[PDB]
Structure 1
């Protein structure tokens, strides 16, 4: 197809749960066991083929520490989509994700598409957040949910593409 679309996406979530790793996997097809902590935010772009449209993603990868919370609106304000990420082995990160969802539903664009990534799914032997519980939470809050693994690539391209399809 000859159509071209572009949209802004922001990743939010407790540090560290794998936000930068998810972006690196999608954008560069790489994964770093030793990933440097993000300071403020980092920016990357990726262009993909979605049916008859060339979709370009402008991605803001935010630093998740609480000291950066006040900067968050600078990144989500004009976003068309967000991926709120938690680590499936860390229940506290899942609770933190729910608070990011609340903040987006109250302060971001009313039409923003919100995805929820249960990351580090490859560490299911250390699971702390039940898949069905997270799915029910996502369904009740109209969030696009998938468990992902930046380490193995499981559902990484899929979650980004599912978002693009719903814009």
Structure 2
């Protein structure tokens, strides 16, 4: 196909859940076991093939530490999509993700597509957040949910592609 679309996407979530790892896996096909905490935000782009459309993603990978919370609006303000990420081995991170979801639903664009990533799914032997519970939460709040693993690549390309498919392309 010859159609070309571009969308702004932002990732939000508690520090250490794997936001930078998810983006690097999607964008560069890389995974760094020793990835350092982000300062403020990092920016990356990736283009994918979606049927007859070439979709370019402008991605804002925000720093999750609470001291950067006040900068969040700068990154999600004009976002057409967001991925709120939590760590399936950390219930605290899951609760924090729900609060990010609430903030987006109240302050970001009203038509924003919000996906929920239950990351570090490769660490299921240390699971603290039930898959079905997370699925129910996501269903009740109209969020696109998938458990993912930046480490193995499980559902990484899939969650970004699922978002691309749901964004307006006429």
| Normalised TM-score (structure 2) | 0.98
TM-fit CA distance, 1:27: 0.1
Give distance in 2, aligned partners of 1:98 and 1:123. 21
Give distance in 1, aligned partners of 2:143 and 2:94. 14
Give distance in 1, aligned partners of 2:68 and 2:37. 12
Q: 4+ runs of 1 displaced by more than 2 Å?
A: none
Deviations 1:35-62 (A, max 9, x none): 0110000000000100000000000000
| Normalised TM-score (structure 1) | 1.00
Give distance in 1, aligned partners of 2:107 and 2:14. 18
Give distance in 2, aligned partners of 1:137 and 1:37. 28
TM-fit CA distance, 1:155: 0.1
Deviations 1:89-134 (A, max 9, x none): 0000000000000000000000000000000000000000000000
How large is the RMSD of aligned CA atoms in angstroms? 0.2
- List gaps (5 residues or longer) in structure 1: none
Deviations 1:11-55 (A, max 9, x none): 000001000000000000000000011000000000010000000
Aligned counterpart, 2:19: 19
**SS where residue 61 of structure 1 aligns?**
strand
Note the 1:1-150 alignment, pairs <5 A: 1-150=1-150
Give distance in 2, aligned partners of 1:113 and 1:45. 18
- How many equivalent residue pairs? 167
TM-fit CA distance, 1:147: 0.0
